[PDB]
Design a protein around this ligand. Sequence first.
Ligand SMILES: CCC(O)(CC)c1cc(OCCN2CCOCC2)c2cc(-c3n[nH]c4ccsc34)[nH]c2c1
Length: 241
Amino acid sequence: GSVIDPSELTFVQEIGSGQGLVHLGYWLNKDKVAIKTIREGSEEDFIEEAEVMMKLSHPKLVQLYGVCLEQAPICLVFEFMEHGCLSDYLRTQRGLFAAETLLGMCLDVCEGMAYLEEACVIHRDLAARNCLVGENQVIKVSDFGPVKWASPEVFSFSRYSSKSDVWSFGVLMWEVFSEGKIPYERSNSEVVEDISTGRLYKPRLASTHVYQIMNHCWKERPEDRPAFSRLLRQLAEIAES
Ligand SMILES: CCC(O)(CC)c1cc(OCCN2CCOCC2)c2cc(-c3n[nH]c4ccsc34)[nH]c2c1
């Protein structure tokens, strides 16, 4: 449920565009909220996506205050993340990050993805643009309810699983260590031939052990790729050593 009347919401500033629109605002003139308004060209699937997200609780997953369904265009009321999306945050603060901080960002995404893996929830579009930065550089996964991030099963047969998200996490790991760089920059049809031949280059900030995990995520077979539960302890071992 969690229905919010449009009078309870106050629109302050437009922060995002495309997709639909992201606005900075206030709910009941008290809480800083991120209002995600739908674009003209589905209303039912948009409301369904929020209901799934409201039933999944993890410190590394974005939380919703409620939904505004009364007036069209409809909108979802999210908790405001101070530092925006991960993809933009990495590019703006480029050259200021340490390898320890970048691995910590990857561990935050892996924590939320391990919870979704156990709950049998598949994130069909896992990328740095779909991750948010909050207080004290904490990373939260968003929109859990684009051939560059897609696995061979996805771009050829549309087979979605938790192991296909592992591939997307591998590309996400590349985006973090390269400090917000665009993967395969190169059309979607051209990227298919490069992946099928048998990958993304090793970023300067990423070590041999970090890049080894990225290739484990980039395995041709889904069964060869490690599970998010295994990846979490694997990434934690690198942080200690
Ligand atoms: C105003 C402060 C700041 O510019 C960071 C310096 C910012 C910007 C934000 O939007 C970035 C634009 N993207 C464009 C791509 O689609 C997502 C939004 C966002 C978006 C959020 C946000 N917080 N919570 C949620 C949930 C979905 S988006 C979002 N917080 C933001 C903060």
